[PDB]
Design a protein around this ligand. Sequence first.
Ligand SMILES: *C/C=C/c1ccc2c(c1)C(C)(C)c1cc(N(CC)CC)ccc1-2
Length: 133
Amino acid sequence: TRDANGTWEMESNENFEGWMKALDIDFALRKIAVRLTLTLVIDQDGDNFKVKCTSTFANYDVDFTVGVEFDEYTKSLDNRHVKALVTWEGDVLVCVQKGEKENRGWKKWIEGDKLYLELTCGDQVCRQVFKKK
Ligand SMILES: *C/C=C/c1ccc2c(c1)C(C)(C)c1cc(N(CC)CC)ccc1-2
């Protein structure tokens, strides 16, 4: 479905390390990140999205409108400037972040009370699954 609203709790997280390594995240912050609980809160009204990812130590919040390019500065991730664009490819929510890294972005599939998330950077894909709280 297109409706991604909800509080989403992580069920699984595969190749998180490899993805963070492809983004050049400090080996320090990687070790912290693998231990922290991650809650994904999405607020969706029409084309307008507010996404908040929250750990005990890190917040990653981004707001966007589907179909409208936006400049992004990944301050609490790898601290790069990208040109981001989120679109629908059928029911798949796709994000393409143009910049230094190739193949960079993420795809979200909402299947009922499950959310599947693939994050990509270079030749690395991290695969996550959340359950609606
Ligand atoms: C639809 C999901 C997109 C998206 C963008 C940015 C991040 C995420 C998902 C998370 C939840 C995978 C995430 C986690 C983090 N750290 C903790 C807050 C871990 C590296 C940063 C950015 C994003």
